[PDB]
């Protein structure tokens, strides 16, 4: 696990889990959850999207691994309609322009 070090994707990861309670079916979608899973991941948590939602991650990544990465989170969002908080985790993408490096 990695409760440190993550940063920008902090607000990828938090994105799914902070605009939950009807984001993650759209982002568990877009990020490539077969209907079968949100059939899935709902009967594991039937009483909690914060839960179901991270447990995506583990797939969610597991699918598109390289296509993985903090613009697939925001860039996942703008699929999403859900541009909001595609626009708060754009700022994520601000937040790489700094460790990004690779000026030439």
């Not at 908080?85 to 030439?104: I, K, P």
Request: net charge neutral.
């Amino acid at each position: 696990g990695s409760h440190m070090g993550e940063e920008d994707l902090c607000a990828a990861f938090n994105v799914i889990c902070d605009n939950v309670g009807k984001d993650w079916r759209r982002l568990a979608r877009q990020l490539k959850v077969s209907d079968t899973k949100i059939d899935s991941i709902e009967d594991r948590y039937p009483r909690n999207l914060t839960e179901r939602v991270r447990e995506s991650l583990r797939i969610w990544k597991n699918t598109e691994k390289e296509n993985a990465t903090v613009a697939h989170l925001v860039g996942a969002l703008r699929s999403c309609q859900m541009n909001l908080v595609a626009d708060l985790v754009q700022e994520v993408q601000q937040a790489r322009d700094l460790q990004n490096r690779s000026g030439a």
